[PDB]
């Protein structure tokens, strides 16, 4: 809608960057095309399409309007075949904002290389859950989003921690606005599994081996959460929702200029959710606050200061899964889905806060530089108490394990990078050169020396959580871990021919972990990045890539000789085809991929049967593993009012024994989520459905009372979602979400410490949203 503009005549490059900023729109243009040209003056309250054609007056440029993006082109009478993947400079470093796009497909993305690229231009599997997708299906936290992310499987550790797999691996890489956090373990990682979506525009998941921008990390993927940003027009909304099991959510979101000119701009969001659960005596209060201010120091230098805060505060937390698999005498336990082995007072509260500042500067070069400063906190307060072990006994009694972990992780990050174009052999290429530093410091107390506790409960079958709370005693342990990451990276994107784009880059990494454990060090480790994209038609491109990653091992993972295993490492080999339709409104991708892991930690059963080094009592073995698999996806417009996100993923991951592994992650999965906006009489009704299918999944668990391995199978099952919204009013709308329509009873965990967890039964959510 009508925006306040003030772009005086200047280098067309600068004007377009200035335009993107003022218009809250992503401008994409070609550097060689705008380099010898200037904008004409625009001033005053204008609609952005009126504004841009006015700005482009005299330049010979055309505008392609595409959602929250505009691409500028300068057509010639010549042209010998179009350079679809031509180097393009961009006004927003993080990509296209999805908020208001009305789409389930992203516009442009920087998750791969820092370079702002379309999914079609990216030689990696990149899925995105867009703002609209999130709104439509009421995906209100990262757990919700993951569950709806094609190619991801969400499994439960416990009531307050989920696992996200991709391609055989737990994902343990989280970024915020393209900045990695430290996720060495749940110490550093509190709250990552729980982020509320109220503050985010989209989550982008980069599958494979993502060392280039993550640095040290897990295989599988990176989850990159892009924060909402301030807008140049005032706008906001209040949201209210009510769902099954006393699930209440409220939300506020306010954005706009804070001065008459618009040179300081802010966005604030507050969200609160208090919910019970299908699980007995489990409740959780979550709170989020977020403020961000953008100050324009001048036309081409912006300072951003922001803070965020999320508290996740549950009662009846489990330690491991909802119930034990086997009773005292070896039979499978058969319990309702409402069973919760958590004690009433058991709580794994997790909290997170960020304070962050950026400085962004556009150089009249068409280059941009950006400094990102982060202070992050991941805190936990975890007095846990849960039935665990082989229970009940015949007399229907059980025993509780109780331990308390409190702690905080303080983190500091500096990221500086420079990105821009450059001529070489007559053609335009682009480059990112960057450097990064993070220091993160974990400090905690643990308590396991319970003083005078009677940890037995008299009634398992009617377990309520109604057990006493122990005297925790004095601290049993003081955590003091310190992780230091230093990185330097460079990626070039050479426009080799009119259809060929070659990506060559890498990261050099310095990783130090210091504290109570023997010091872990890796210096000057090189992480290569090699990719190619070949254009086939106006529509299809093929791409191939070789990417890598490592994670220095947990310090308990030592070997036969008490030497720390070499870092857990992997390369992803990928070849595939990407299609782009309707001017980027619909994307399809088909990929074959292979992850070769090496130095994957493993028990070492032959040593461990009778240790022979007094030095180590429980060594680990560092083996190779492989993931073979393929993936198909589609997202975007299928017809005018009709959006989808869908995916198909096949995987098998075997280790150096040849045995299948991550067998709780199904070998085959399908996701399809769709919504349809009607026209004419009922153009105010959005109707929507979704399905998730997954094939066989199983776990080998040991039945202690019978001294034997058992197989726990989860037969293939569907989950069906349904969704409807009515825009009753310009400013007010109502929604219903029904999840798991057929009330499929299934498991999200079998075998995590000999326990099991159910997935959500049929639940509803009703919401109204009020836009000012």
268 near ligand N8E, rule: CB under 6 A: yes
Nearer to ligand N8E, 12 or 288 (CB): 288
558 near ligand N8E, rule: CB under 6 A: no
Q: DSSP state, 556?
A: T
Listed residue (361, 69, 87, 95) closest to 224, CA to CA: 95
Number of chain positions touching ligand N8E (CB under 6 A): 14
Q: Judge contact between 175 and 436, C-beta under 8 A.
A: no
Burial class of residue 645 in the structure, from the number of CB atoms within 10 Å of its CB (0-12 exposed, 13-18 middle, 19+ buried)? buried
Nearer to ligand N8E, 254 or 437 (CB): 254
How many whole angstroms separate alpha carbon 461 and alpha carbon 395?
Answer: 10
Number of alpha helices (DSSP H) and beta strands (DSSP E) in the chain: 7, 43
How many whole angstroms separate alpha carbon 621 and alpha carbon 605?
Answer: 9
Give the binding range for ligand N8E (CB under 6 A) out of 55-63, 302-310, 492-500, 763-771.
302-310
Nearer to ligand N8E, 177 or 428 (CB): 177
Nearer to ligand N8E, 173 or 413 (CB): 413
Nearer to ligand N8E, 307 or 685 (CB): 307
526 near ligand N8E, rule: CB under 6 A: no
Measure the CA dihedral 555/556/561/563, to 10°. Answer: -10
Binding track over 140-159 against ligand N8E, x by CB under 6 A: --------------------
> Closest distance between ligand N8E and the C-beta of residue 380, in Å?
23
Sign of CA dihedral 92, 93, 95, 100: negative
> Closest distance between ligand N8E and the C-beta of residue 672, in Å?
38
Listed residue (758, 759, 753) closest to 388, CA to CA: 753
Sign of CA dihedral 133, 137, 140, 143: negative
307 near ligand N8E, rule: CB under 6 A: yes
234 near ligand N8E, rule: CB under 6 A: yes
433 near ligand N8E, rule: CB under 6 A: no
Nearer to ligand N8E, 266 or 383 (CB): 266
DSSP assignment of 319-332 equals SSSSEESB-TTSPB
> Closest distance between ligand N8E and the C-beta of residue 257, in Å?
7
Q: Kindly report the CA angle at 522 between 517 and 525, in degrees rounded to 5? A: 160
Nearer to ligand N8E, 207 or 267 (CB): 267
H helix runs in 420-527, sequence order: none
258 near ligand N8E, rule: CB under 6 A: yes
Give the binding range for ligand N8E (CB under 6 A) out of 305-313, 325-333, 470-478, 527-535.
305-313
In this chain, which of 266, 299, 383, 421 binds ligand N8E, going by CB under 6 A? Answer: 266
| Cβ count near 552 (within 10 Å) | 23
254 near ligand N8E, rule: CB under 6 A: yes
Nearer to ligand N8E, 355 or 433 (CB): 355
Give the binding range for ligand N8E (CB under 6 A) out of 118-126, 263-271, 458-466, 539-547.
263-271
Give the binding range for ligand N8E (CB under 6 A) out of 18-26, 186-194, 249-257, 367-375.
249-257
Q: Is the peptide bond before 596 cis (omega within 30 degrees of 0)?
A: no
570 near ligand N8E, rule: CB under 6 A: no
In this chain, which of 255, 341, 457, 740 binds ligand N8E, going by CB under 6 A? Answer: 255
Neighbouring residues of 515: CB distance < 8 A, sequence distance ≥ 6: 442, 479, 480, 481, 482
> Closest distance between ligand N8E and the C-beta of residue 291, in Å?
2
Neighbouring residues of 274: CB distance < 8 A, sequence distance ≥ 6: 246, 248, 283, 284, 285, 286
Two tokens at 668?
A: 């085959």
Q: Phi/psi at 136 (nearest 5 deg)?
A: -65, -45
355 near ligand N8E, rule: CB under 6 A: yes
> Closest distance between ligand N8E and the C-beta of residue 546, in Å?
41
**Using a CB cutoff of 8 Å and minimum separation of 24, what contacts does 719-722 make?**
719/691, 719/692, 719/693, 719/744, 719/746, 719/759, 720/689, 720/690, 720/691, 720/744, 721/137, 721/673, 721/689, 721/690, 721/691, 721/692, 722/688, 722/689, 722/690
Nearer to ligand N8E, 211 or 266 (CB): 266
305 near ligand N8E, rule: CB under 6 A: yes
Neighbouring residues of 607: CB distance < 8 A, sequence distance ≥ 6: 560, 619, 621
How many whole angstroms separate alpha carbon 550 and alpha carbon 212?
Answer: 10
Name the residue whose CB lies closest to ligand N8E: 291
> Closest distance between ligand N8E and the C-beta of residue 175, in Å?
21
672 near ligand N8E, rule: CB under 6 A: no
Give the binding range for ligand N8E (CB under 6 A) out of 91-99, 261-269, 311-319, 731-739.
261-269
Give the binding range for ligand N8E (CB under 6 A) out of 160-168, 253-261, 321-329, 552-560.
253-261
Nearer to ligand N8E, 242 or 305 (CB): 305
Q: Which residues bind ligand N8E (CB under 6 A)?
A: 234, 254-256, 258, 266-268, 291, 293, 305-307, 355
């Amino acid at each position: 809608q009508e925006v306040e503009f003030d772009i005086p005549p200047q280098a067309l490059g600068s004007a377009l960057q200035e335009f993107g900023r003022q218009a809250d729109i992503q401008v994409l243009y070609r550097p060689e095309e705008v380099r010898n040209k200037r904008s004409s003056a625009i001033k005053g309250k204008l609609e952005p399409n009126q504004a841009i054609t006015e700005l482009l007056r005299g330049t010979g440029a055309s505008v392609d309007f595409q959602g929250n993006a505009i691409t500028i082109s300068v057509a010639e009478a010549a042209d010998s075949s179009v350079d679809l993947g031509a180097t393009m400079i961009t006004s927003n470093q993080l990509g296209t904002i999805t908020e208001d796009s009305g789409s389930y497909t992203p516009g442009t993305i920087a998750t791969a290389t820092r370079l702002v690229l379309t999914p079609r231009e990216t030689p990696q599997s990149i899925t995105v859950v867009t703002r609209q997708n999130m709104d439509d299906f009421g995906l209100n936290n990262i757990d919700d989003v993951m569950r709806h992310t094609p190619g991801i499987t969400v499994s439960a550790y416990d009531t307050d921690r989920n696992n996200y797999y991709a391609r055989g691996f737990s994902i343990n890489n989280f970024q915020y606005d393209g900045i990695p956090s430290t996720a060495r373990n749940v110490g550093y990682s509190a709250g990552n599994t729980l982020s509320d979506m109220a503050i985010y525009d989209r989550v982008e998941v980069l599958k494979g081996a993502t060392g280039l921008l993550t640095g040290a990390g897990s295989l599988g993927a990176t989850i990159n959460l892009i924060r909402k940003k301030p807008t140049h027009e005032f706008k906001g909304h209040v949201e209210l929702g009510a769902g099954s099991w006393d699930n209440y959510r409220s939300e506020l979101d306010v954005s706009g200029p804070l001065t008459e000119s618009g040179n300081v701009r802010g966005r604030a969001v507050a969200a609160y959710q208090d919910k019970h659960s299908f699980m007995d005596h489990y409740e959780r209060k979550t709170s989020v606050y977020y403020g961000i201010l953008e100050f324009d120091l001048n036309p081409d230098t912006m300072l951003t200061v922001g803070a965020d805060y999320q508290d996740n505060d549950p009662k009846g937390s489990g330690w491991s899964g909802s119930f034990p698999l086997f009773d005292s005498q070896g039979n499978r336990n058969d319990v309702s889905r409402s069973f919760n082995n958590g004690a009433k007072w058991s709580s794994w509260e997790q909290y997170t806060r960020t304070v962050f500042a950026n400085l962004e500067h556009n150089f009249a070069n068409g280059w941009v530089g950006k400094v990102q400063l982060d202070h992050k906190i991941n805190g936990y307060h975890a007095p846990l108490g849960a039935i665990m072990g082989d229970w009940p006994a015949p007399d229907n009694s059980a025993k509780i394990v109780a331990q308390k972990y409190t702690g905080e992780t303080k983190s500091n990050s500096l990221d500086i990078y420079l990105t821009g174009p450059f001529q070489f052999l007559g053609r335009e290429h682009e480059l990112v050169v960057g450097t990064s530093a993070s220091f993160s410091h974990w400090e905690g107390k643990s308590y396991w020396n319970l003083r005078n506790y009677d940890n037995t409960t008299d009634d398992f079958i009617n377990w309520d959580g109604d057990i006493g709370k122990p005297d925790w005693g004095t601290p049993s342990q003081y955590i003091d871990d310190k992780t230091r990451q230093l990185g330097s990276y460079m990626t070039a994107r050479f426009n080799v021919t009119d259809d060929l784009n070659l990506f060559l880059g890498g990261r050099v990494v310095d990783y130090r972990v210091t504290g109570l454990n023997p010091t872990i060090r890796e210096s000057g480790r090189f992480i290569p990045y090699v990719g190619a994209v070949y254009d086939l038609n106006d529509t299809y491109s093929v791409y191939a890539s070789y990417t890598d990653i490592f994670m220095p091992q947990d310090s308990w993972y030592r070997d036969s000789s008490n030497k720390l295993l070499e870092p857990d490492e992997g390369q992803n080999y990928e070849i595939g085809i990407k299609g782009e339709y309707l001017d980027g409104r619909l994307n399809t991708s088909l990929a074959y991929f292979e992850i070769h892991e090496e130095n994957r930690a493993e028990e070492d059963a032959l040593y461990n049967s009778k240790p022979t080094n007094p030095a180590i009592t429980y060594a680990y073995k560092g083996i190779k593993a492989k993931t073979k698999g393929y993936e198909a996806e589609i997202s975007g417009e299928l017809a005018p009012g009709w959006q989808v996100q869908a995916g198909y993923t096949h995987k098998i991951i075997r280790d150096d024994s040849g045995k299948k592994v991550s067998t709780w992650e199904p070998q085959d999965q399908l996701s399809l989520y769709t919504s349809y906006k009607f026209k004419g009489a009922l153009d105010k009704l959005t109707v929507g459905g979704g399905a998730r299918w997954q094939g066989k999944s199983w776990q080998m668990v040991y039945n202690n009372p019978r001294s034997r391995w058992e197989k726990f199978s989860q037969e293939d099952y569907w989950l069906v979602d349904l969704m409807a919204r009515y825009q009753i009013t310009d400013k007010l709308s109502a929604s219903v979400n029904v999840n798991n329509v057929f009330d499929k009873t299934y498991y999200t965990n079998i075998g995590f410490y000999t326990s099991a967890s159910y997935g959500d039964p049929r639940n509803l959510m009703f919401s109204t949203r009020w836009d000012f």
